[PDB]
Symmetry: C2
Subunit: 94 residues, 2 copies
């Protein structure tokens, strides 16, 4: 893997806006020397949006949300958890 | 997407060794604001190997091989094409 600036960021936002990013679950179609299973990535970042301001970048890999390890997570769990966070969000990426 | 140093690299190797990298096809389980379908990434790079020397990095996204656009490519096509290249390989990544 050895890539993407490991960051620990915390984003806050206005009650009726989005944090400003888009995620994407990706499944590996290939057993081999690496490793299989689910992984979610930020795919789009709104310029000026809070996620941008927090220092988040498209390509960042979501490993921890609000102290919650995200592996094995389906896209919807990741989304449900993020909505479970109101206007506050803490993220440890990759 | 906006990420990963767009590079145009060309790797050569010894007849009985590997270029030194590992790929991985990833499928998106999520229709939304971004974009669906196949995409292959280098997942592992052997230290000192030719791919390393060429300047290839794990995370690099294979878009063109020997002048061949790779989208819609199944993991095996990417592998078959790479083997179709003998000890020479040209790669435009992302």
């Amino acid at each position: 893997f050895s890539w993407s600036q490991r960051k620990l960021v915390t984003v806050e936002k206005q009650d009726n806006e989005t944090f400003g990013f888009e995620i994407q679950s990706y499944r590996p179609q290939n057993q081999n020397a690496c490793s299989s299973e689910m992984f979610t990535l930020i795919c789009k970042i709104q310029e000026d949006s809070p996620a941008h301001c927090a220092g988040l970048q498209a390509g960042d890999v979501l490993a921890n949300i609000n102290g919650v390890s995200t592996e094995g997570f389906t896209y919807k769990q990741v989304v449900d958890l993020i909505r479970s966070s109101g206007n506050l969000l803490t993220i440890e990426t990759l």
